[PDB]
Amino acid sequence: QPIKLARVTKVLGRTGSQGQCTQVRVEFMDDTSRSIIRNVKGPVREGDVLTLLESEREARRL
């Protein structure tokens, strides 16, 4: 089970019961065709790289 890394395409909004986690959609540089939505904890810019321990589950939109 390898580990994937991807770049965010845009910031969708601030979610969580207390507004501490952000939903963004990530775009793999390994494959320029597949994009998914993920929650991310912490301040996130546009274009940075997220280290995905596992890249199989998709975060529901808010």
């Binding site: 597949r34 998914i36 939505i37 998709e58």
Partner: protein, 101 residues
């Protein structure tokens, strides 16, 4: 005071309509009074259609739908926000909310 002209239902010349069962809980609701919802969705969400399509053994495979009709009591409709309270003037109109998306 009488809140609604039709008393929350669509019975006008019958005197008895058969009851049904809600889908959230098993409440017995008259068929005319219940809140019908006829949902039509794909088997797979829009986030998974490409994954399935790339795996299909056919070519240009149509995606099947899934038709199911939901029945709701008043209490379960308010709690699930399918309907909500409106102002007294706004209660009278009965066209459904916009179908733009």
């Amino acid at each position: 005071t009488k809140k609604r002209r039709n008393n929350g239902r669509a019975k006008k010349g019958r005197g008895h309509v058969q009851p049904i069962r809600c889908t959230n809980c098993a409440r017995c609701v008259p068929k005319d009074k219940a809140i019908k919802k006829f949902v039509i969705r794909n088997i797979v969400e829009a986030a998974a259609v490409r994954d399935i399509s790339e795996a299909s053994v056919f070519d240009a495979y149509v995606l099947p739908k899934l038709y199911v009709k939901l029945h709701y009591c008043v209490s379960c409709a308010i709690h699930s926000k399918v309907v909500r309270n409106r102002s007294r003037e706004a209660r009278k109109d009965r066209t459904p909310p916009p179908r733009f998306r």
